[PDB]
Amino acid sequence: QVQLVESGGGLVQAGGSLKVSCAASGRAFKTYRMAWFRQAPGKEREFVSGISALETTYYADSVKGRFTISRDNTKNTVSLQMDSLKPEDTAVYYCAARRYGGTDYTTTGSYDYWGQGTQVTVS
Amino acid sequence: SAVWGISVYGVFVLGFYIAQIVFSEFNRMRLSDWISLRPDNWNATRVAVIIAGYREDPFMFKKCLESVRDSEYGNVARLICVIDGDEEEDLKMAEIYKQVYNDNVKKPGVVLCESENKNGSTIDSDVSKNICILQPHRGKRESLYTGFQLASMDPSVHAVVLIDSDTVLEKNAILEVVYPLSCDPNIKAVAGECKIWNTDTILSMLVSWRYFSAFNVERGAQSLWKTVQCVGGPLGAYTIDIINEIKDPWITQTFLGNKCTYGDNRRLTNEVLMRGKKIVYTPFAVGWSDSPTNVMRYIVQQTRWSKSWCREIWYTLGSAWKHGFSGIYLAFECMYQIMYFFLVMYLFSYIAIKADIRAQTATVLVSTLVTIIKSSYLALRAKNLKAFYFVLYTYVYFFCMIPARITAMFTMFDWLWAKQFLITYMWWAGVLAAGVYSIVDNWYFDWADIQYRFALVGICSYLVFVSIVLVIYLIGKITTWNYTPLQKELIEERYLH
Amino acid sequence: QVQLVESGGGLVQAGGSLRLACAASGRIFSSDTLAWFRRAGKEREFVAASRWSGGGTDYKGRFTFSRDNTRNTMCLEMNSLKPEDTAVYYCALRTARDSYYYTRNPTGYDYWGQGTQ
Ligand SMILES: CCCCCCCCCCCCCCCCCC(=O)OC[C@H](COP(=O)(O)OCCN)OC(=O)CCCCCCCCCCCCCCCCC
Ligand SMILES: CC(C)CCC[C@@H](C)[C@H]1CC[C@H]2[C@@H]3CC=C4C[C@@H](OC(=O)CCC(=O)O)CC[C@]4(C)[C@H]3CC[C@]12C
Ligand SMILES: CC(=O)N[C@@H]1[C@@H](O)[C@H](O)[C@@H](CO)O[C@H]1O
C-alpha cells in the first residue's frame, strides 16, 4: 500500500528537456516495481518506460534513445528524464507501482497502484 | 573492496589448489617409482610395534591385535603393549591381550617418566618374548615413552611403528610404512594414511571423506616437499636414533592438553623437523579408525584441535624458519588457512548486510561448482562413486568449524557448557536472524525481470540438487550400499559375539 | 584351536615321486611358521619350513615348498628318492604369540600332527 504523488511538468518548448519526479510513501519502497504511463486526450494509455527493483530499464517506441528512467532509494522517489520532447507527446502522465506480477507489465491492470498524475504539455 | 576480495580469493584459492594437486601427483609418482625398484620379500629393516591405549573396547583391542598379527612383514622383532592404568577395570585389556598373545604381562609399581633410572632394563629382562606393561595411570605421553625405552634397549631394531589401540592395519601396512626409510638416509619418519571404517552416520561419512581428501592433498604435498607435519598416530613410523635423541625434550615439555589423553604427536614431529631431518608420507599404508557420531562431541574436539592447531602453527613456523630454501610451505599453508577463514567470515558478513539476490546466487553457484569439481577429483583419485557425498560437507563445515575456531580464539584471547556451546548457539541464532532478514527484505515476485528469474532458477536448482543428494544418501543407507565392506564383517563378528 | 591332518604316502620304489599335503581347519593369522619333519629310531630332524606370508628355508635344491594360500592346504612334493628318506613325515606348527624369532628346535613347536608314512 503506497500512495503515489506527482510534482513537475509545465509548459516547455518543442525539442527541450523536461523533468518529472514521483514520490511514494510506504514501508519498503526498495521492493516495488515502478512504471510510467501517459494518457493522450483521444487515446488510451500505453507503456512508455518502467524500472524494476533490480534496476532493469525497459523502453519502447523510440524511448530507448530518447528518455532515461532512474530511481533513488535513499530519497524514496523516482524521476523520469525526458529529452527532446515533441508536440505529439503532450499528455497527462500517471505513475504505476507493483509488488507481485508476472510476464505482463504493459497493461494497466497489471499494476495495482496509481497516482493522481501530472500534466505535461509541449509547445 | 568486494571486487578485490573476491578476485584475491579466486586467484589464491585456485593457485593453491592446483599446487596441492600437482604436488600430490608428483609425490605419488615418485613413491611409485621408488617402490617399483625394490626387491621382492624385502625385510632389511627391523621394526618393533608399540600399542598404547586406555579404556579401549575389548572387541576393538582384540581386532587391532589380530590385525597386527596378520601383518606380512618378516622382520618384526617384538610387540610392545602399554596400558595407562593398573586398576581392576584395566585388567580386562591385559586379559584380552593374553588371549591373542603370550601371557608375559608385567605390572611395575613405578613410571619410567618419573623415575631416576629411565632405562627399560629396570622393568624388562628378556627381549625375545613380547611384554605387556600395566603402569600406574599417568597419561598417553608416558605410555609412549615406556614403549620407546623398551624398543631402545634392543640394538637389533632400527625403527618403531606407532599405532592406536583401535587401529586396524592391512597385511602390508607395516612394510609400506617402513620401506621409504631406507630409500633416503635423510628420512627419519614416515606417516601412514588413515581411513574411517564406520560410515553409518551422515557426519561419519563426511568426516571420512574430509580425512581422505586431507591425506590426499596436504599430506601428499608435504611428502613431496619432505616437510611433513602430520606424523604420528594412528599409523606412523619413526627411526630409533631420532626418538632416542628427542625423547627427553618431548617428555620434559609442559602439557596443558587433554587430561590423560591426546598424546602429543604434534610436538614430536616438530622436534624432528627443527633438527633438519626430512620426513615423507605414503598413502599405500592404510589404517582404519573410528569417528564420533555426535555433533556436540565433534564440535568440542574441533575446538580443542583448533587450539592445538594455533599453538603448533606458531611452533612449526618457528621450527621451519631454519631450512632456508625449503620450510616455507608450512607457513604458506598457515597463511592460506588464515586468509581462507577471514575471507569466509567477511563474505558471510557482506552477504548478510547487503542482502541482494543477484550476487548471492552467483556466489552459491560458484561454490557449488568448485565443490562438485573437488568431489569429482576425489572420486577419480579414489575410484569410488561415493566421494560425491563431499558436497554436503560445506553445511557441516559452516555450522561447526566457524564456532569452534571462534571459541578457540576467544579462549586464548588476551559454566562448563557456557564456554563450549553458548558460542555455537549464538552463531546459529545469528545465522538464522540473517537468513530471516534476507528473506523478509527480498520478499517480492517479479517474473518480468530476467535477473529475478535467473536468481530464482538458480536457487531452485541448488535446492533440487541438495534434495536429490539427500535422497540418494537416504536410500543408500537403507540398501546398506554406503556401508564399508570392512564395517559389514565387523558388525557381523560383533553380532556373533 | 587348529588341527593338522595329512594325506598321501605309501610304499614307493626309489624311482618315483611322492606328494604330501598338510591341511588345517581354522585361522592361523598368516604369521605362524609351518615346518616339516622326516623321522619320528632317532630324534626328529628338520626338513623344510617357510612362513605363511612368504619366504622359505631348506636343510637342498631338490624339495620345494608350495602353498595355495586360499584353501588352507599345503603341499610338498619330492623329486627322486633315496633308500634313507623313508620315514613317518610330520606336519609342524609354531605359534608366534610367545616370540617372533624362527627356531629350528622341534621343542618350540607346541602343535603337532599325526604322520602317514
Ligand atoms: C507464471 C509462472 C509461475 C512460475 C512459478 C512461480 C511460483 C510462485 C508464483 C507466485 C505468484 C504470485 C501471484 C500474485 C497473486 C497470488 C494470489 C494472491 O491473491 O496472493 C496475494 C498475496 C499477497 O501477498 P501476501 O498475502 O503477503 O503473500 C503471502 C501469502 N500469505 O500474494 C502472494 O501470495 C505472493 C507471494 C509471493 C512471494 C515471493 C517471494 C518469496 C520469497 C523469495 C525469496 C527469493 C530470494 C532468496 C535468496 C536467498 C536467501 C538465502
Ligand atoms: C522457515 C523459513 C522462513 C526459514 C528459511 C531458512 C533458510 C532459507 C536460510 C537461513 C540461513 C541461510 C544460510 C546461511 C549460510 C550459508 C552457506 C553457503 O555456502 C558457502 O558459503 C561456501 C563457502 C566456501 O567454502 O567457498 C551456502 C548458503 C547458506 C547455507 C545459507 C542458505 C539459506 C539459509 C539456510
Ligand atoms: C591422531 C592425530 O594425528 N590427530 C591429529 C591432531 O593431533 C591434530 O591436532 C589435528 C590437526 O589437523 O590432526 C589430527 O589428525
**Helix B202-224 vs helix B393-411: angle between axes, to the nearest 10 degrees?**
70
Which residues of chain B have a CB within 8 Å of the CB of A99?
A: 444-445
Q: How far is CA B88 from the centre of its chain?
A: 33
Task: Specify whether the CB–CB gap between B429 and B365 falls below 8 A.
Answer: no
C-alpha cell at C18: 611322492
C-alpha cell at B388: 560425491
Cα distance from C62 to chain B (closest Cα, Å)? Answer: 22
β A100-101/B445-446 pair status: parallel
Establish whether chain C is in contact with chain A, requiring a minimum of 3 CB pairs below 8 angstroms. Answer: no
C-alpha cell at C49: 619350513
Q: After which residues is chain C broken (C to N over 2.5 A)?
A: 40, 59
Q: Which residue has the cell 561415493?
A: B386
3-state DSSP assignment of residue B329: helix
Task: Specify whether the CB–CB gap between B182 and B275 falls below 8 A.
Answer: no
Q: Which of B230, B310, B314, B405 to mutate to test the pocket of ligand 3 (most atoms within 8 A of CB)?
A: B230
The reply to whether ligand 1 has any atom less than 6 angstroms from the CB of B413 is: no
C-alpha cell at C96: 608366534
B/e letters for C95-104, b = 16+ CB within 10 Å, e = fewer, are bbbbbbeeee
Question: What is the gyration radius of the CA atoms in chain C, in angstroms?
Answer: 14
Instruction: Give the span between the Cα atoms of B70 and B76, in whole angstroms.
Output: 12
Out of C53, C96, C100, the one facing B77 most closely (by C-beta) is C100
Task: Specify whether the CB–CB gap between B80 and B49 falls below 8 A.
Answer: yes
Mutation target among A27, A49, A54, A111 for the B interface, most CBs of B within 10 A: A54
With vertex at residue B282, the alpha carbon angle to CA B51 and CA B35, rounded to the nearest 5 degrees, is 115
Sign of CA dihedral B308, B309, B314, B317: positive
Burial level of B33, CB count in 10 A (0-12/13-18/19+)? exposed
- The set of long-range contacts for B422-429, using a CB threshold of 8 Å and a minimum separation of 24, is B424/B299, B424/B400, B427/B402, B427/B403, B428/B399, B428/B403
Task: Specify whether the CB–CB gap between B293 and B396 falls below 8 A.
Answer: no
Instruction: Give the span between the Cα atoms of B308 and B266, in whole angstroms.
Output: 9
**Selection from B160, B209, B152 nearest residue B46 by Cα:** B160
Residue type for C44, please? R
Distances (CA, A) of B218 to B213, B334, B397: 8, 12, 18
Return the residue of A nearest to B358 by Cα: A54
Closest ligand relative to B17 C-alpha: 2
Task: Specify whether the CB–CB gap between B303 and B404 falls below 8 A.
Answer: yes
Residue type for C30, please? S
Instruction: Give the span between the Cα atoms of B429 and B418, in whole angstroms.
Output: 15
Instruction: Give the span between the Cα atoms of A81 and A20, in whole angstroms.
Output: 7
Rounded to 5 degrees, φ, ψ at B481 are -70, -35
Chains touching chain C, criterion 3+ CB pairs below 8 Å: B
B/e letters for B355-375, b = 16+ CB within 10 Å, e = fewer, are bebebbbeebeeebeeeeebb
The reply to whether ligand 1 has any atom less than 6 angstroms from the CB of B15 is: no
- CATH number for the domain harbouring residue A34: 2.60.40.10
3-state DSSP assignment of residue B381: helix
Instruction: Give the span between the Cα atoms of B219 and B193, in whole angstroms.
Output: 9
Q: Which residue has the cell 575446538?
A: B303
3-state DSSP assignment of residue B182: helix
Q: Is C54 on the interface with B (CB under 8 A)?
A: yes
Instruction: Give the span between the Cα atoms of B405 and B338, in whole angstroms.
Output: 11
β A118-122/A91-98 pair status: antiparallel
β B47-53/B159-164 pair status: parallel
Task: Specify whether the CB–CB gap between B321 and B379 falls below 8 A.
Answer: no
Strand residues in B369-443 grouped as ranges (E): none
A111: alpha, beta or left? (left if phi > 0; alpha if psi -120 to 50): beta
Look at C29 and B66 and tell me if their CB atoms are within 8 Å. Answer: yes
Residue ranges for the known binding site of B for UDP are: 84, 165-166, 301, 305
B401 Cβ neighbours under 8 A, 6+ residues apart? B302
Residue type for B37, please? L
Residues spanned by the domain of A18: 3-122
DSSP letter (8 states) at residue A42: S
Which string of DSSP letters, residue by residue, matches C7-59? E------SSSEEEEEEEE-S--TTTSEEEEE--------EEEEEESSS--B--
Look at A56 and B443 and tell me if their CB atoms are within 8 Å. Answer: no
Which string of DSSP letters, residue by residue, matches B428-445? HHHHHHHHHHHHHHT--E
3-state DSSP assignment of residue B103: coil
**Residue of the CA atom closest to atom 9 of ligand 2:** B435
Task: Specify whether the CB–CB gap between B427 and B410 falls below 8 A.
Answer: no
**Residue of the CA atom closest to atom 4 of ligand 2:** B436
3-state DSSP assignment of residue A115: strand
Residue ranges for the known binding site of B are: 52, 54, 56, 84, 139-140, 164-166, 211, 264, 290, 301, 304-305
Q: Is B119 on the interface with A (CB under 8 A)?
A: no
Q: Which helix (H) or strand (E) holds B28?
A: helix B2-36
Instruction: Give the span between the Cα atoms of B175 and B43, in whole angstroms.
Output: 8
Strand residues in B20-111 grouped as ranges (E): 47-53, 76-84, 105-106
With vertex at residue B171, the alpha carbon angle to CA B165 and CA B173, rounded to the nearest 5 degrees, is 65
Task: Specify whether the CB–CB gap between A20 and A82 falls below 8 A.
Answer: yes
Task: Specify whether the CB–CB gap between B144 and B117 falls below 8 A.
Answer: no
For the CA atoms of B133, B135, B138, B143, the dihedral, rounded to the nearest 10 degrees, stands at: -20
B/e letters for B188-215, b = 16+ CB within 10 Å, e = fewer, are bbbbbbbbbbbbebbbbbbbbbbbbbeb
**How many residues are listed for chain C in this entry?**
117
Distances (CA, A) of B160 to B40, B66, B75: 22, 19, 12
Task: Specify whether the CB–CB gap between B136 and B85 falls below 8 A.
Answer: yes
**Selection from B34, B397, B349, B391 nearest residue B184 by Cα:** B34
Helix and strand numbers (H, E) in chain B are: 15, 10
Instruction: Give the span between the Cα atoms of B159 and B482, in whole angstroms.
Output: 38
- CB neighbours (10 Å) of residue B186? 11
A89 Cβ neighbours under 8 A, 6+ residues apart? A38, A120, A122
Residue ranges for the known binding site of B for UDP-N-acetyl-alpha-D-glucosamine are: 52, 54, 84, 139-140, 165-166, 211, 264, 301, 304-305
Instruction: Give the span between the Cα atoms of C106 and C92, in whole angstroms.
Output: 8
Which string of DSSP letters, residue by residue, matches B153-168? T-TT--EEEEEETT-E
Q: What is the largest CA-CA distance in chain B?
A: 88
Instruction: Give the span between the Cα atoms of B135 and A116, in whole angstroms.
Output: 93
C-alpha cell at C86: 623313508
Instruction: Give the span between the Cα atoms of B173 and B70, in whole angstroms.
Output: 10
Task: Specify whether the CB–CB gap between B73 and B175 falls below 8 A.
Answer: yes
Instruction: Give the span between the Cα atoms of B486 and B387, in whole angstroms.
Output: 17
Rounded to 5 degrees, φ, ψ at C47 are -120, -60
C-alpha cell at B417: 557448557
DSSP letter (8 states) at residue A116: -
Task: Specify whether the CB–CB gap between B296 and B421 falls below 8 A.
Answer: yes
The CATH architecture to which B20-293 belongs is Alpha-Beta Complex (3.90)
With vertex at residue B296, the alpha carbon angle to CA B143 and CA B202, rounded to the nearest 5 degrees, is 100
C-alpha cell at B220: 601428499
Instruction: Give the span between the Cα atoms of C22 and C8, in whole angstroms.
Output: 9
Return the residue of C nearest to B70 by Cα: C29
3-state DSSP assignment of residue B131: strand
Sign of CA dihedral B412, B414, B419, B425: negative
Task: Specify whether the CB–CB gap between B201 and B295 falls below 8 A.
Answer: no
Instruction: Give the span between the Cα atoms of B298 and C83, in whole angstroms.
Output: 73
Structure-determination approach: cryo-EM
Look at C54 and B74 and tell me if their CB atoms are within 8 Å. Answer: yes
Task: Specify whether the CB–CB gap between B204 and B215 falls below 8 A.
Answer: no
C-alpha cell at B374: 573437488
Rounded to 5 degrees, φ, ψ at A89 are -85, 0
Strand residues in B230-275 grouped as ranges (E): 235-239
Sign of CA dihedral B340, B345, B346, B350: positive
How far, in Å, is the centroid of ligand 3 from the Cα of B164? 13
Q: Which helix (H) or strand (E) holds C75?
A: strand C74-79
Give the count of domains, chain A: 1
B276: alpha, beta or left? (left if phi > 0; alpha if psi -120 to 50): left
3-state DSSP assignment of residue B262: coil
**How many residues are listed for chain A in this entry?**
123
**Selection from C45, A52, C59 nearest residue B358 by Cα:** A52
Instruction: Give the span between the Cα atoms of C102 and C99, in whole angstroms.
Output: 8
Sign of CA dihedral B250, B253, B257, B261: positive
Strand residues in B185-277 grouped as ranges (E): 187-196, 235-239
3-state DSSP assignment of residue A118: strand
Task: Specify whether the CB–CB gap between C112 and C57 falls below 8 A.
Answer: no
DSSP letter (8 states) at residue C65: -
Which string of DSSP letters, residue by residue, matches A47-103? EEEEE-TT--EEE-TT-TTTEEEEEETTTTEEEEEE-S--GGG-EEEEEEEESEE-S
Instruction: Give the span between the Cα atoms of B364 and B424, in whole angstroms.
Output: 23
C29 Cβ neighbours under 8 A, 6+ residues apart? B66, B69, B70, C96
The boundaries of every CATH 3.90.550.10 domain in chain B are 20-293
Mutation target among B62, B72, B103, B105 for the C interface, most CBs of C within 10 A: B72
Instruction: Give the span between the Cα atoms of C5 and C94, in whole angstroms.
Output: 16
What domains, with CATH codes, occur in chain C?
Answer: 3-113 (2.60.40.10)
C-alpha cell at A42: 483521444
Instruction: Give the span between the Cα atoms of B439 and B475, in whole angstroms.
Output: 32
Sign of CA dihedral B487, B488, B493, B494: positive
Instruction: Give the span between the Cα atoms of C52 and A48, in whole angstroms.
Output: 90
Q: Is B440 on the interface with A (CB under 8 A)?
A: no
Task: Specify whether the CB–CB gap between C47 and C36 falls below 8 A.
Answer: yes
